């Protein structure tokens, strides 16, 4: 094992996950990519290569092969609520959202992530990175009501479990995600939702992807939990010194 580390990214066909997968592939001088997706559909979306496996994190037997012989894991899975199909705007309600049964945050963001961290640990992973969301400091956050899922709460439960696990970890609580260009913004690190009080509380999905990659390359990123926002493009100088960036972070949770 002068060999480069094998990095498995889960949720690899999701919007952020697909970018991590791409960056892991391009980074063939530093990493060996692997990916886990929920469907043959998702597999083809990211290129159908043989380093992509299909499995469901709520059924732990199915994800086992993906987890074999990995040195690092980037968890990019999430419960995803859908619009309840009954909606009729023209007498003032607001849309209700739901999660399919067995697809609620408790099952996917807590249990699902527990499944992944547990199998990673069985496999002897060296570093687990997880992406979640800002808001977690406030259990009354409106997002928790989405589909009655308590999504932030269950996610933070998995983050806590990860932090308590004994495996070196990086927890990245993203601000509101943007479908905009990465690598073109100064990136900001925060603690305990402080950025929610600022105007720099959103972040390109590409920059979240890049922070995940850099986490893998600096000891400084290990046993760290932090929030991730950004300043807008064209305003200031895009982050390049990640050692500095991660040395700003002291929080373990
Ligand atoms: N949206 C925001 O503004 C916001 C803000 C802050 C943080 N975040 C968090 O940021 C992270 C990335 O967000 P994103 O929008 O880029 O993610 P995303 O597009 O929703 O991708 C989530 C992935 O999870 C996968 N997944 C769901 N259930 C699964 C299961 N049972 N087994 C295996 N995979 C499963 C989905 O697979 P499929 O492709 O098959 O559906 C999907 O690829 C998420 O944790 C999200 O909660 C989001």
Q: Residue 168 forms beta bridges with which residues?
A: none
For the chain, the domain total comes to: 1
Experimental technique: X-ray
Question: What's the Rg (C-alpha) of the chain?
Answer: 18
Ligand 1 center from residue 79 Cα (angstroms)? 6
Three-state secondary structure string covering 64-116: HHHHCCCCEEEECCCCCCEECCCCCCCCCCCCCEECCCCCCHHHHHHHHHHHH
- Residues lining ligand 1, judged by CB closer than 6 Å? 11, 13-17, 38-39, 42, 56-58, 76-78, 80, 108, 112, 131-133, 174, 176-177, 205
| Helix 15-26 vs helix 205-215: crossing angle, to nearest 10 | 50
Cα–Cα distance measured from residue 204 to residue 172, given in angstroms and rounded to the nearest whole number:
13
User: For residue 228, what are the contacts with CB-CB under 8 A and spacing of at least 6?
Assistant: 172, 173, 174, 175, 187, 188, 189, 190, 203, 207, 208, 211
| Residues 175 and 134: beta-carbon distance below 8 Å | yes
Q: Are 13 and 37 within 8 A, CB to CB? A: yes
DSSP 141: -
Q: What is the Cα–Cα distance from 233 to 181, expressed in whole angstroms?
A: 8
Q: Which of 18, 67, 77 is the pocket-test mutation for ligand 1 (most atoms within 8 Å of CB)?
A: 77
* Resolution of the structure, angstroms: 1.8
Q: Structural domain of residue 29, as residue ranges?
A: 1-253
User: Cα–Cα distance between 147 and 106 in angstroms, integer?
Assistant: 12
d(CA 115, CA 66): 12
Distance CA 56, CA 36 (A): 9
**Number of C-beta neighbours around residue 25 at 10 A:** 16
- The conformation of residue 201, written as its DSSP 8-state character, comes to -
Tokens of 100: 């399919």
Ligand 1 centre to CA of 21 (Å) is: 14
CA-closest candidate to residue 68, choices 138, 136, 128, 123 = 123
For residue 31, the domain's CATH number is 3.40.50.720
Any residues with CB less than 8 A from the CB of 133 and at least 6 apart, and which?
Answer: 143, 151, 152, 155, 173, 174
């Amino acid at each position: 094992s002068a060999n480069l580390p094998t990095v498995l990214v889960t949720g690899a066909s999701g919007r952020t996950g697909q970018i991590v997968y791409k960056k892991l592939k391009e980074g063939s001088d530093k990493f060996v990519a692997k990916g886990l997706v929920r469907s043959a559909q998702g597999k083809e979306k990211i290129g159908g290569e043989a380093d992509v496996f299909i499995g469901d994190i709520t059924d732990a037997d199915s994800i086992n092969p993906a987890f074999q012989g990995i040195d690092a894991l980037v968890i990019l899975t999430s419960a995803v609520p859908k619009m309840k199909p009954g909606f009729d705007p023209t007498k003032g309600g607001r849309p209700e959202f739901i999660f399919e049964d067995g697809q609620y945050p408790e099952q996917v963001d807590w249990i699902g992530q527990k499944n992944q961290i547990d199998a990673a640990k069985v496999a002897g992973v060296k570093h687990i990175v997880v992406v979640g969301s800002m808001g977690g400091t406030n259990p009354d956050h409106p997002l928790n009501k989405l589909g009655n899922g308590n999504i932030l709460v269950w996610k933070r439960k998995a983050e806590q479990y990860l932090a308590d696990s004994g495996t070196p970890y990086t927890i990245i609580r993203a601000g509101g995600l943007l479908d905009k260009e990465g690598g073109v913004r100064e990136l900001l690190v925060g603690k305990d939702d402080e950025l929610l009080q600022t105007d720099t509380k959103t972040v390109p999905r590409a920059d979240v992807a890049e922070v995940c990659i850099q986490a893998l390359l600096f000891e400084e990123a290990k046993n760290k939990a932090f929030d991730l926002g950004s300043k807008p493009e064209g305003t200031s100088t895009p982050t390049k010194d990640f050692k500095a960036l991660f040395s700003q972070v002291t929080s373990r949770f």
